[PDB]
Every structure is written in C-alpha cells, then in structure tokens.
Design a protein around this ligand. Structure first.
Ligand SMILES: Cc1cc2nc3c(=O)[nH]c(=O)nc-3n(C[C@H](O)[C@H](O)[C@H](O)COP(=O)(O)OP(=O)(O)OC[C@H]3O[C@@H](n4cnc5c(N)ncnc54)[C@H](O)[C@@H]3O)c2cc1C
Ligand SMILES: Cc1cc2nc3c(=O)[nH]c(=O)nc-3n(C[C@H](O)[C@H](O)[C@H](O)COP(=O)(O)OP(=O)(O)OC[C@H]3O[C@@H](n4cnc5c(N)ncnc54)[C@H](O)[C@@H]3O)c2cc1C
Ligand SMILES: Cc1cc2nc3c(=O)[nH]c(=O)nc-3n(C[C@H](O)[C@H](O)[C@H](O)COP(=O)(O)OP(=O)(O)OC[C@H]3O[C@@H](n4cnc5c(N)ncnc54)[C@H](O)[C@@H]3O)c2cc1C
Ligand SMILES: Cc1ncc(C[n+]2csc(CCOP(=O)(O)OP(=O)(O)O)c2C)c(N)n1
Ligand SMILES: Cc1ncc(C[n+]2csc(CCOP(=O)(O)OP(=O)(O)O)c2C)c(N)n1
Ligand SMILES: Cc1ncc(C[n+]2csc(CCOP(=O)(O)OP(=O)(O)O)c2C)c(N)n1
Ligand SMILES: [Mg+2]
Ligand SMILES: [Mg+2]
Ligand SMILES: [Mg+2]
Lengths: 589, 589, 589
C-alpha cells in the first residue's frame, strides 16, 4: 500500500483543520498542489494576485477565529513576497504555516536558476524554520510545522524542494499528531494575588480598569466590575469589540488612536487594573506617569511587570481573575471620581455624534462611519487597514462582542484589510464582511479585489480617498519643522472595481452618503464585491494625545485655534468636571 | 537621588537571585564590574580561565537547581567564546543571561578596533537578543533579559557598549520586575485522557514504562506503578537518578549509552507509557518499531505525538498523571512478562558486578566506577563530560534521587564537566562534587582546574586516560571501512594538577584503585581540589545496541567472538528468558 | 572507473595546495578522514587538543605565507569551537576553508542526537556558506569552497552530513578548478593621481609617510622615499617588519601600542602619505585631527577616503605607486622638520635601550625582549598573542623584512599565539618560531603545547607571568573610577610543560635572563618545544597615547610623577626639539 507524499501532506493538513492554502501556483510548488483534491481530500487552494495578500489572509484567518492557515511562496521571489504577512503574524503571535517552494534537490548549491539558500529569510521571526533534507520526511515535517505553529503561536516555515512531493512511500511511513492536540484550560489565579488586588482596589480613591484583548469574551464581567467599584474603563486599540459601544463608563483608548476621556483619565487615576494587555506605548509615551498603584493580570509570565512596576501580579486567565475580584471586592455606592468621568465621556460623545450626523456638505470620514453604523449587520466583521482614516474607526463604529475588529496592530503593515476580508469571508461565508481602507493602503493591494470576485467571497470595500496621507500630514510639524510632500492625484477606484468584475460607487457629499451606502449593501447582498470610493476632505481627527483645552496647560489663542480647527468649541477639559464634583487635578498646576 | 547604572544593574540581578557572574574582567566590561559589591550589593564575580567555561558554568548552575546564571564575554572574542555554553543551554532549554561587552557607543559602526556587529552571533539560538541603544535603558533591558530567560527557558543576550554603565540616572528611573515573578503550578491531566490510558494499560500483555526527566521527583510513584501493573521500567540517559539504582524492575536505557535489558525489552513490548520524555533517538534508531500502543504524558503540547504516533495523549504534570493512573489502574498479581524481565535484568547485573569487582590487573573504567561507588557520599553530585568512558557511568554509578547527575546530553559539548563542577559547588558549597572526564575533554578544559583551587571550591576530577578515543574508535568500522587514526601520547595530568595548586594522583592497576580513591576523597575533604589520572585500558563498553547473543539473530562464530571480546560468556539473550516463562519473541524469527 | 567521494575531496584539496587539515577526528567527520593518504594522496591531518586552536592555525598558516588552510569541526560543539578562528580570518580577510561535520542525512530535521541547523552559525562572516544537499555534489562544493576562499579572501564554510563521503561515484563525475586559478598582477596607478600626490609632497613643509601592510615587500623603497624628501615614517601595528628596526627616520606606530615619536609626529604633520593602510583608530582617536592634506594609496576602492577625506586618491599597488612617486618627486637636501624628528627618535631609542639593557633586578618584560634580540635567528618568525606584554613587543623586537610578525590585530582574539606557531612551523619546518604569550592568553591554550611536541614541530613559547592583566589594569582609571579586580595566583607553567613532554624554564631575575634564554634556544635546536615562564613585575609600558612631558600640556607635578613612574626622566617632549630647529608647534598653545 503506497501513497504519494503530496497526498500524505494534504491528509495531514486536513487533520489539523488547515483546509485552505493561499498562494499562486507554479513550478516549484506544483508537486504539492497536484495532490490536492485527491482521494476525497478536502484541502482547497485559494489563488491570490500577490503572495503577500495570500500570507496576510492565511494569518488574518486565525485572527478572526478561523482554522490554521497555510500560505505558500514559490522559490525565491514567491517566498520573499510573504514577508509582510509573516512578520505581522510573528509580532501578533498568530499561528501560520508557510511553505517555501524550491528548485529540485539536484539543483541546490549549484547556483542554478532561481536557486538560493532561503533558510536565512525567515529564521529571525520563525518558531520553526527548516529545509526538508529528503522527500520521505516531508510528511513528518509538515505535521510538526502545524503542531509547532499552534503550540508556539507563531510562524512555522518549511523550504520544500519541488521534486519531493512526487515521491511515493508506504502508507505506514507517515502519521498525523493532530489527534494528540491538547491545549491548556484557563489557569486559575492565586488567591493570595487576588486578595492583594482586592485590598488595593478597595482603598483606591480613583480606580481605573485598563483592559486589553486578554479580556476578550469577558466584557460583561468587566463592565459589571466597573459598575460595582465605580471604576471607569479604558480599552486598547485592539479590544474595542469587548465592550458595548455605548457603555456609560467606557472612556476609549489612550494616546493618538484613542478618545479624549481615556487620555485624561489615565493621567488622573491612582490605581490601575491592567488586565490582559501589553500596551506598546506605555513607557515611551509615559502613559502611567501619574499612577500610584499598578495591578496586572496576565497568563504570560513574560509580561508581568513589563510595562510598569507591578505592585500586584496575577498569573492567570483574565476571566477567572475578574470573576474572583468581582466576588471579593466591596461594592461602591457613589463616587465623585465616577460621576466626573461619566460626564467627561458624555461630553465627548456629544462631539462625536454631532460630527457623524451632519446633514450636508463635503464628505468627511465621520459621516462615512455614520452610514456604516446605520446599515451594518449587528454581527458584522471589520477588517481594518493601517492609516489615519481607518484606525480612527474606533472612535465611531458602534460595536459589541457580536462583532470582530482586526487589523495589523503592532507590525502595522498597510494592505492588511483586503487579506483580512478574504480570511474572514473564507471562515464565515454567510457573514457581512467590511474592509475599511485608506487610498494609500488600497493602492498596495487593490489588484486582489478580483480575488473576492472570482471566488464568490462578497465583501464591502470602503476606501477613503484624501489625496495626501492624513496621518503622515501630522508628522512634519509635530516632529519636523519643514513643510510636507505626500501628494497623490486621484485615480477612479470605482472604475477599477468595475473593470475587475466588482461593483463600484463614488461619493463626495454628506447628503449622498446614506443612499450610496444603502445601494452598496444591497449590492453586496446580491453576491457582489463592492468598492465605495469615498472622496473625503483633508480634515484630520482631533489629536487626543495633545488636548489644547485646559486653560492651565495652554494659552487662550491655542485653545481658540484648537477648537476652531477641530470644531471642538463644546469640548470641556476633564479638570472642569473633576472640580465640579469637588475634586482637584493631581498633576495640573 | 542619583544612582550609577552599573549598580542599578547589579541590584536588578540580585533581585532575580542571579548573585553570581562568570567570566573574565576586561575593558569592555569594566564599567559593569566596577559597580559590583557597592552599597551592600551581594553579586559576586567568579573569574574563569576561558569564557566558555564561564558560560557552561552559568548554565550548569541552573541544571543543578541553582540560581539564574549570568555569563559575560568581552567585545568580539570574549563574546564568541561563550558559544558552546549558550548552544548547550538553548538545546536543553536552560535559562541563562549572557552579556556581551562592546566598544563604546561612539565607536560603533566606525570599523574601530575590535568593533563589530555582534547581534547576528546568537540570534538563532536566543529567546532575547538586543543591542542596548542608550545607557539609560540598560537597567530595564537587564531586568527583561532575566524575566525572559526564565519565562522562555533559554538564552537571553544583551550587547552592552562599555561606556553605558558609567552613566548616572535618577533612582526612580529604574525598577525590577522580579517581585512579579510567577510560575504555573503543576497542571492536572484531563480525566478523559487518563481513563483512555488506564484502559490500554489494563488490556496490555506486555506494558513498559519509559520515563524521562519529566518524572524527576516522582521516582517512587513510578516504581510503585511499575510494581502494581508489573510493567518494567526503561529510563533515559538524563533520568537515572530518579530511580533507586537497584530497583528490581529497572532495565536501564535504550540504544548505545544504555543497558542490555532495556534494549531487548523495548523490542518485545506491546504498550509503552512514554512519560515526560523527548528521547532523540526514537525515529532514527527505530526504538518503537515493534510497539502496538503508545501513551504519552507531557506538559508541553509541542511534544505530544512527536516521537511516535500517540494512541493516548495526556497534557499535564507527570507526577499528577502517574498518581491518577496508579489510583485507577487494576493491580496485577503475576506476569510472565514481568518475571522474564526481572531475570534478564538480574543476568545483566551479574555481568556488570563481576567487571566492577575484579581484584587485580590493568585498570579498566569499570573498577574506577566501583571505587567511586564505595567512597562517594549518598548525596554526591556528578558532573559528567561527553565521551565513551564518562557516559558509560550510567551502567555503573549506584545513584538514587539523593544524587544529581548532569551532562551536556543533546548538544553534547565536550568540556562540560569542569564547568558543571563549578556551578554545582557554587550552589552547594558543603556537598561532594565529582567531575568525571575523558582525557580528550579534560584537555579542552583542564586549565580551569585552577579556578576551583583559587575560589576554594573543592571538587574531585576523575580523568580516564585511554590514549585513543574509545567512542571514536567505534565509528571507523560500524560506519566506515578503513582503519582509525585517533592517537594521543600521554601527558602527566597529576603533575599538571600539582602545578595548579591541586592534588594529583595517578593509578593504573586495579589493586591500587581503592587506596588511591580513599586518599583522593580524604584530600578533597581537607579542602583540596583533586585530579585522579586513571590510566585505563583500551577496552570498550559492550555494545548493547548490537547484542550478538541470540542464535537466531547471529552466527555461532559471531556470538563466540562477541562473548570473548566483552567477557560476556554468561550474558543470556532475552528470548531465552521469555521462552522459559512460556512466552515467544514477537519479532525474532 | 569509480572513486570514493572522500578521496575525490582529498584530491581536490591537494590540487589547491591545501595539504593540511587541522582538527580532532570523530564520527561526523570520519568518512572524510578515512580517505586521507589513499592512492598516494598527500593531504595530512594535524590533530589539535581544542578545535579553536585548529581553526586559528589553519588561518595563521596563510597569514605566514603558507598554503590554503582547512579546518574541521564535528557536528554541533566541534563546529562552534571554530568561531574565534573564523571571525579572526573574516576580519583580517584571510582565506580559509571550514568543514562542519554533521549527523547523517537521514537524521537531519528529526531533532536527533546532536542534530541541528548549523547554517546560521557562520552565515554573517562567511563568503560562502552551504549545507551539502546530497553526496554526489560534495566534490564540486569543496572545490568551489577553495576557489571562493581565495578569490573572496575569506571564510568558506561547508556543512557535510557524515554519510556522504562514503558514497562512490564515477571518476569522470568530478574535477578541480585549481588549474584555472588566476590572480591579478599589481595594478599600475593613474599618472594623474601620482602627479597630484607629487605636487602636494613637493609643497609640504612637514610631510610624513604612514605605511600599512599594503607596503609589505617594499620597505627599502619607502625608506628611500623617506630620505629623498626628508619625510619621517610612521608604521602600523601590523607592519613593523617592513622596516629595518634601526632605520634613522622610523618613528614607530601611533596610539597605545606605539612609540612616543610617532604619536607626537602625527599631531605636528601637515601632509600625510597614507600608503596601504586601514588604521582602525583613525576616527575614534582623532589621529589626523591636525593634518592639512591627506594622500591615500590603496588597491581596494572601498578604502579610498575611508579613514579621512583624501585630497589625493591613488588606486593601485603600493609598490608601483611608491616607485612612481620616488621617481617624480623633488629631492630635499635639508629640513628642520626632519632633523627635529631624528633627534626625537634618538631620544626615544635611548630610553628603550636603557630599559632593555638593565643588568640586575626583578625581571621586566623589557629584558626578556632584550634576550630574544640577542639570541634569535635573523629570519625568526614571531607569533604574537593579544595582551599588554605581548603587543608591546613592537617597541623592542629588532626586526627586518627577513622576519615575520603576525597576531590577531583586529578581532584581537587571545590564544592566537600557539595556533600561529603551528601554522608557521608547518609551513617552515627548519625555521625558528617564537610564540610570545601573556599568562592569561596562555591559560586559554596551553593544553595545545602537547601538539607541537607530538608532531615534532619545535617552537619557543615565551610566557609573561604578571598575575593581574597589565593592559586591563589600565582601564579602571583611564576610563572607570573604581579600583580593579583582575587577580591570579601563579601556576607553574614550566612544570606543566614538562608534564606535556616539553622543556620548561622559569626565570624571575634580570641577571639570569640571558643564560636561561641561551639554554632555551639550545634546547629548541635539539628538537624540543620549550616554555619559558617569565615571572615579571607589574610594570606597565609607558603610555605613549598620553605623554605627560610637555610643560604647556601638563603640570610640573604630573610630569614629575609621570617621569618617576616610567623611569622616563630623560624623555624630552617633541616640541623642545621642534623649537631647537627654529620651528613651532602647530597645536600646542
Ligand atoms: C497605526 C496604529 C496606531 C495605533 N494607535 C494606538 C493608540 O493610540 N492606542 C492604543 O491603545 N493602541 C493603538 N494601536 C494598537 C496598538 O499598537 C496595540 O496593538 C494594542 O494596543 C495592543 O493591545 P492589547 O494590549 O489589548 O493586546 P496585546 O498587545 O495583543 O497583548 C495582550 C495581552 O493579553 C494577554 N492575554 C491573552 N490572553 C489572556 C487571558 N486569557 N488572560 C489574561 N491575559 C491574557 C497576553 O499574554 C498579552 O500580554 C495602534 C495600531 C496601529 C496600527
Ligand atoms: C554522547 C551521548 C550519548 C548518549 N546516548 C544515549 C543513549 O544511548 N540513550 C539515551 O536514552 N540517551 C542517551 N543520551 C542522552 C540523550 O541524548 C538525551 O539527552 C536524553 O535521552 C533525553 O532524555 P529525556 O527524554 O529524559 O528528557 P528531555 O529530552 O529533556 O525531555 C524531557 C521531556 O519531559 C517533559 N517534561 C518536563 N517536565 C515535565 C513535567 N513536570 N511533566 C511532564 N512532562 C514534563 C518535557 O516537556 C520534555 O518533552 C546520550 C547523550 C550523549 C551526550
Ligand atoms: C590589543 C591590540 C592593540 C593594538 N594597538 C595598536 C596601536 O596602538 N596602533 C596601531 O597602529 N595598531 C594597533 N593594533 C593593530 C591595529 O588594530 C590594526 O590591525 C593595524 O594597525 C592595521 O594595520 P594596517 O593598516 O597596516 O593594515 P590593514 O588594516 O590590514 O589594512 C591594509 C590596507 O592595505 C591595503 N593593501 C593591501 N595590499 C596592498 C597593495 N599591494 N597596495 C596597496 N594597498 C594594499 C588593503 O586594501 C588595506 O586597506 C593593535 C592590535 C591589538 C590586537
Ligand atoms: C507597508 C507599509 N508601508 C509604509 C507604512 C508607513 N505608513 C503608515 S501610515 C501611512 C500613510 C498611509 O496612507 P493611507 O492608507 O492613504 O491612509 P490615510 O492616513 O490617508 O487615511 C504610511 C505610508 C506602513 N505602515 N506600512
Ligand atoms: C567540543 C566537542 N568537540 C568534538 C566532539 C566530538 N566527540 C565526541 S566523543 C569524542 C571523543 C572524546 O574523547 P575523550 O574525552 O578522550 O573520551 P573517551 O571517548 O576516550 O572516553 C569526540 C572528539 C564533541 N562532542 N564536542
Ligand atoms: C578571547 C578573548 N577574551 C578576552 C579578551 C579581553 N582581553 C584583552 S587583553 C586581556 C588581558 C589578557 O591578559 P594576559 O594575556 O595575561 O596579558 P597581559 O595584559 O597581562 O600582558 C583580556 C582579558 C580578548 N582580547 N580575547
Ligand atoms: Mg489617504
Ligand atoms: Mg580518551
Ligand atoms: Mg598577564
């Protein structure tokens, strides 16, 4: 009883649940692909236009809760095109199997055509990186690659000479260890550490909960704890979906891609409950410079006390920890700290709502997000690209745990949106998927819009056309001293979409946004991939990391100019709200 | 309130329990070392003669249950000398902090004297590998390096420009996260998996327990389980101390560095309980080629089903798993399989004992080990080097859990013995420490014998002088086809020892061994480091991976020659014992 | 017609002149070594005690003008032990072939015993780094490795699975490209650039010639040019042998390992003729801070204008360039600049000679060098280790082009002396070879003294025993602010030497030095390797990089203390000599 090595490989991938391979077919990968669909195998190939899109899609697939992704790249240039997707997965600790094709074994080291040592290529970021030495061990290595990708939460790479998959072996000369896959259940926290945390929280006059994705799946519990001890909630740029968008005590996120409330709260807080987070701006932006006590909860020992000295360290699942704390902590009836924060939050929501609900004028991204909120399904999935217009989505999207919002948050590679949409739609074929993209990022990946069309994976692409980079337009004055230089004409994305078999729309006026969005959604429900080219203004989101509103921190002229520029006449500095409740700023003046 | 960065670094190391730095002082490391012993700091420097010895000692320190080790290497050649120690730690998953000195910041990239990019040097094996960008962050990075070394169980590397440690900072500009150190407690296994294991064990006619270091600390329980279900025990080359050397059912280890019983048992077994092991020879030597069922217990998901398909996979602490299995499994009163094995083991012990107890003649390593057994403390520590004479120690040393036996088991670097002795003696100053070394390995490290002398860390070095490499003398016929070529004259190690301030002994006769060993131990108890130059024969340990004893596997001539060569006339093939109990070989004929 | 791959490999090495392989025999290298000496092959194996010594010897062999060296390291720890030797070769641009042994092909990627990916190990420093993919291509790759090592002037690395060399192939399936070896002849400089150089030299009032090893073989011409235009000569730490030690206008080298004259001259010069040098201290020590014009000659375009802006750049052989300049430049009859320099040099020689010729007292390295000068052959070879006592040899050894002086000048790895002696003696069996070593460096390599003994390669080891590191004792005050901490007892090296089959001597008094040196040389001429343990004082060489002698640069107290400490009462600051000739310092005051 013999079996083709390529088929054995497909059977192994199938056993691990990796039923989708992303890439472009070619010579150095043909032997493997030729076995797909054989003997009832269910592994399918999803062909992309650029390998980086395939790599990112394989990765985003897991981020969205899908199966283990597999991405391939032909010897040399195909393999190197995977880099942005693999680095993203490495930094986000996302499991993914990358198979690098290669010239046949006989050609290795001969300086043959497109023949090179690809082992160095991804050695720095991989959790597994090997060049298959002979055909007969390919199955064992693919099996281990999957096992390692999952166990080590990262990129497992295999360089495979193109002649190996054609070889035949005895069926008893291969096996899958997928049946032995086991994962650790939630780890219960140490009572000693939970008690120390409870004591600090009980004695704090200004507690604040800072929740990262470690709290995913436990938003209701966090909101319950927040209300019990009257502690406002701050979230991370990756964790907005965990909370009800309209939660009374949600202050948003800190720093640039955040809200005004969160940025003011963290500088006035006394005790922080850092739950399931590895906020990267912590040290360099002095996020916790005014905090007195720091309590951290995490399942990874490497993270304990990393972003700030921890007065209390809790090793364990955030869910279990939050529950234990919720049960032991004292209830707080009233709090000036809480009252002041709720008003500060309400003030901010009045501002955001007024921008979103404008009725006429030149289109701004604010109204595009408004239209999305008015037409999106309650369980819609959002694949967000990297840029100023897209990341500001967290100030507008009315999400809940029913949604999923993913991007490239740390490596922050542009072009992640479209790949994300493919991974999502592949995992949830009957679910509404949105790709929110800036024109710069769209320009790096729009050729792959045809991929959604060809594979009947309908998505809604929302493109923000604002000529010059909005975000980049904010780093030649706040850091530099000269002008700018980031111009771009204006290509017709809607026309390009039509040329690709997709449905294109173009909108540039607030009064036309709702209708255009309605037609776009209806078109998507008819099974079409759509591209909405939103010609927006040059307006930038109000800089919440530099709030020029407090008269004790900035001059009248500054405040006046700041308000006029961002239409923020009605925003009120947090200190006013603190003082209105009988409290005083702990750092201002 | 200011503080020297070097001192802050020492305070951090002290907080993590890393109170010993191994290396050689010099310019590119002086700024750091100059702060040692300041403001009551207790971090001490242990100066070696070769940096590789310092690196290996820092690593072996942890292997022996000591504190986190720190090793330093001066810019360029000092740092590169650490390689063998770091690779060993990487492959053994042992935490260790390596600090690479470097030319001052101003000289970087200038192609100055001894100035180079050292980031590539250890990037492949490190769990952390960074070049400090500016003086003020050195404390934070040393703190994280320790946190990462421990959490990731590996090598954390920092390249430190020599001018950084001289800089001063505010005391509030640094902190240690050592107080937040937390580790996961033993993980309880899934009842479902324990039950599946119990069912297989209950229905097995020939069960065998294969225990690796995952069972460290639970030998009594394993021995109890072995007796309850009448399953012989096989151990790994790293796990002998876990069992009482004279346990009735201990068959030893498989393959070359093993015993005859274990090698025959594994080929006749039906069900294997692979507990806490990652035996590297599994696949390439077909260790489990005749097994029917395979049950594996491990705390690392990456290992489940790695060395063989697992019919049952148990994720969890070996201790807890063994206890649960012991409690649920059915007791077995009698077993022909067990009886046959006990006799096979007894036959082997008769052979080994007869070699160890010879009374007169040219010295063989067998009698050296006999002398060690007759004079060593019950809690003696053994630091074993890499070679034929030293590794065969597991066939002779009468150990128990009261002992510790460590070597370089996977990377297998020669020269690990002396460094191991330093790490051990540093951790246990009042405990008997033995370094068992071959002359080849001794020749790579004997200059450091002076280190034990100078720091008053008395150890007993036992050197096997056999001219040509015993092990290497067995790879020019069993693999090659030509002669050999591994000669060495015979230097006077005892004389060298005296020249270094140590006490030297020379012995070449069996009838002189006991007295020499007695004087050596007495000398060590007087506070002296000793070197026993054992001039042994060219005799090689009987090859248990190729037992030429069964008349159905080898010819009369072969058996006759095999017996005469290894004085094994009385060894009896396991099949005879199986048949004597009414059983039949499952593979022979 | 078939041939063993191992033999084909040896035939190829032989054709490239690589007739000596350094290393230690073992399993993963046996297949290759088993073919040595077959079918009249003349490649021999030189067995060392530590692989780093083998690597360094293979490299030093070429530095001393020998054949292409080959060094081997067994899979894992053997290969990693080569690092210090390979990094040295990489930084010095010395050709060398390194063969890394490896577990058999079938074991690769199986996580077998001592099995690992060694491709990352030396990728950063190698000019060629490949893992042989299959047995049949081994010959082609060894051939290319030699071709690349030589053409790229660096380290060519091949990882070779241990089972490949055993395979047989058709004799017509391999060939050597050694017959096609071709090298570029000296490149003639552009007349345009030579003329620009001549013009500057002609118009300079204070010309100085700074000669690096690019001038090797052309010292007489440089000395002739120096005299013709009356330009003093400065040499590099690697180029002393190029000049007659007593040349009237030789000022020595600049910075720490240099002479007083050179250090003062460079700061007073106007035009520098930088010939064949890449002096690493140039920028970081501001060597040329006071120069007005800079003319550089080099055969490597990458070096032109590297160490300083070049007013004139000459691409070409230093010999040809010097000759063209010598022929076109104007002769200079007299020069105050020249006269002042000759007197400054003479003053320095009076100082050095008085220290070297002391008659009685505690031994200092000065008198050891004196004894060497009085007994060494005119064509003696000097292998110098890294340290304060050894590098200061350039202030004392009376060398000429008949000698060869080599060390590890840039990577600066300690332990280079003994390996250098092996490479030298292997290349010149009937030539006197000296290894000058500090006790610290000796302690990292003395086990290999037995290698010279066993292979009958008689060398004279001169060891400076000064307890604490002399050089290191000068970096805890001139850079740090605390005490020191670099103590070492005092082992009996002479006794160790005797134990190794060598002849040991011990000397600690000036009045005994000549006799001891005489007996040592006579013993070496009797075919014995000798070890002279020179117990010297703690005295440090006078710091020429910080001359506290000029009353306009330092205080009376400083000058007085400086003179008393270094017995330099009679040294006169260069400015006095300049002013005596009617000139003025261009920077002092
Ligand atoms: C252009 C751009 C701008 C951005 N701007 C901002 C900004 O202004 N503000 C902002 O906040 N973000 C911003 N981000 C996102 C930011 O870079 C980070 O990716 C994000 O804040 C990290 O969020 P996190 O801490 O929730 O999760 P991660 O960094 O993913 O860390 C999660 C932590 O939770 C732990 N964990 C996981 N599971 C559990 C469990 N069950 N129990 C306990 N612990 C668990 C993990 O071990 C880990 O330590 C931006 C991103 C981009 C691309
Ligand atoms: C020259 C030389 C020759 C050798 N020859 C032999 C030989 O012939 N035979 C031989 O057997 N060895 C030999 N060895 C040793 C061999 O190379 C391996 O290092 C050794 O067998 C590995 O043993 P192990 O499986 O116990 O542990 P490891 O390889 O260290 O693996 C231990 C396993 O236990 C798991 N674990 C850890 N803690 C727990 C826990 N609490 N609960 C559950 N699981 C846990 C780990 O995750 C891991 O999978 C030799 C070594 C040398 C240097
Ligand atoms: C501990 C220690 C201390 C030291 N201290 C000092 C010190 O104080 N002072 C000092 O001077 N040195 C010192 N050195 C040596 C120093 O580090 C350098 O290695 C040495 O100065 C480099 O000398 P170089 O310029 O002659 O040659 P290299 O750096 O080898 O460069 C030679 C140049 O010549 C060129 N070249 C080669 N062939 C030709 C040709 N035919 N024609 C033209 N150009 C050619 C090359 O391309 C190259 O640019 C020390 C070394 C050590 C280990
Ligand atoms: C692949 C990649 N290249 C470059 C960058 C740098 N970068 C970050 S934001 C940005 C501007 C992107 O502009 P666009 O997508 O048009 O978004 P906008 O800021 O205008 O909304 C750039 C170039 C990046 N993050 N990723
Ligand atoms: C650093 C290092 N170099 C080389 C090897 C290869 N090797 C393995 S065993 C061996 C022989 C060692 O001989 P010795 O220490 O004399 O022990 P013996 O086998 O004679 O008892 C060698 C060279 C190794 N394991 N480590
Ligand atoms: C392999 C290596 N390790 C460390 C250094 C750092 N280093 C440079 S000089 C020196 C002192 C060496 O002392 P020794 O050989 O005794 O010579 P001395 O200075 O006393 O004459 C050291 C440790 C180096 N150059 N190479
Ligand atoms: Mg844009
Ligand atoms: Mg030996
Ligand atoms: Mg010294």
């Amino acid at each position: 009883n013999k079996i083709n090595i390529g088929l054995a490989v497909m059977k192994i991938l199938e056993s691990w649940g990796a039923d989708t391979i992303y890439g472009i077919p070619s010579g150095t990968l043909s032997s493997l692909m030729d076995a797909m669909g054989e003997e009832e195998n269910n592994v399918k190939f999803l062909q992309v236009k650029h390998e980086e899109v395939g790599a990112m899609a394989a990765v985003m697939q897991s981020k969205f809760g899908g199966n283990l992704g597999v991405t391939v790249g032909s010897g040399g240039p195909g393999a190197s095109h995977l880099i942005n997707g693999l680095y993203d997965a490495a930094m986000d600790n996302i499991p993914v199997v990358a198979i690098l094709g290669s010239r046949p074994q006989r050609e290795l080291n001969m300086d043959a055509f497109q023949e090179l040592n690809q082992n160095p290529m991804y050695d720095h970021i991989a959790v597994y990186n090997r060049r298959v030495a002979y055909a007969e061990q390919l199955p064992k290595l693919v099996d281990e690659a999957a096992r390692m990708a999952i166990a080590k939460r990262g990129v497992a790479v295999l360089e495979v000479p193109g002649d190996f998959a054609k070889v035949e072996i005895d069926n008893d000369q291969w096996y899958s260890s997928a049946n032995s896959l086991r994962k650790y259940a939630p780890i219960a926290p140490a009572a000693q550490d939970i008690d120390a945390a409870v004591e600090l929280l009980n004695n704090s006059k200004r507690p604040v909960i800072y929740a990262g994705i470690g709290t995913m799946g436990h938003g209701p519990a966090v909101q319950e704890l927040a209300r019990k001890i009257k502690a406002p909630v701050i979230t991370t740029g990756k964790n907005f979906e965990t909370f009800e968008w309209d939660f009374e005590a949600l202050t948003g996120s800190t720093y640039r891609v955040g809200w005004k409330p969160a940025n003011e709260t963290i500088l006035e807080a006394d005790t922080v409950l850092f739950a399931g987070s590895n906020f990267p701006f912590s040290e360099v932006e002095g996020t916790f410079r005014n905090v007195d006590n720091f309590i951290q909860i995490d399942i990874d020992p490497a993270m304990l006390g990393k972003r700030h000295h921890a007065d209390v360290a809790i090793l364990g699942d955030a869910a279990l920890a939050i529950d234990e704390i919720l049960n032991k902590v004292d209830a707080v009836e009233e709090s000036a700290w809480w009252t002041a924060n709720l008003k500060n939050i309400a003030n901010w929501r009045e501002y955001i709502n007024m921008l979103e609900t404008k009725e006429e004028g030149d289109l701004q991204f604010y109204q595009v997000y408004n239209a999305i909120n008015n037409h999106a399904d309650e369980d819609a999935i959002y694949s967000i690209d990297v840029g100023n217009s897209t990341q500001t989505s967290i100030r507008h999207l009315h999400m809940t745990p029913k949604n999923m919002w993913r991007t490239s948050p740390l490596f922050a590679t542009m072009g992640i949106a479209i790949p994300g949409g493919l991974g999502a739609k592949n995992t949830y074929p009957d679910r509404q998927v949105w790709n929110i993209i800036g024109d710069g990022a769209f320009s790096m990946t729009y050729p792959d819009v045809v991929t959604n069309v060809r594979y009947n994976m309908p998505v809604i692409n929302v493109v923000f056309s604002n000529t010059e980079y909005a975000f980049i337009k904010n780093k030649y004055e706040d850091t530099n001293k000269n002008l700018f230089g980031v111009d771009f004409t204006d290509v017709d994305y809607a026309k390009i979409a039509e040329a690709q078999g997709a449905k294109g729309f173009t909108v540039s006026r607030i009064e036309d946004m709702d209708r255009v969005m309605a037609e776009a959604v209806a078109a998507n429900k008819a099974g079409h991939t759509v591209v909405i080219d939103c010609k927006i203004t040059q307006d930038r989101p109000i800089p919440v990391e530099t709030l020029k509103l407090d008269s004790k921190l900035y001059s009248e002229d500054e405040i006046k100019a700041y308000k006029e520029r961002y239409e923020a006449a009605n925003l009120v500095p947090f200190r006013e709200y603190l003082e209105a409740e009988g409290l005083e700023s702990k750092y201002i003046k």
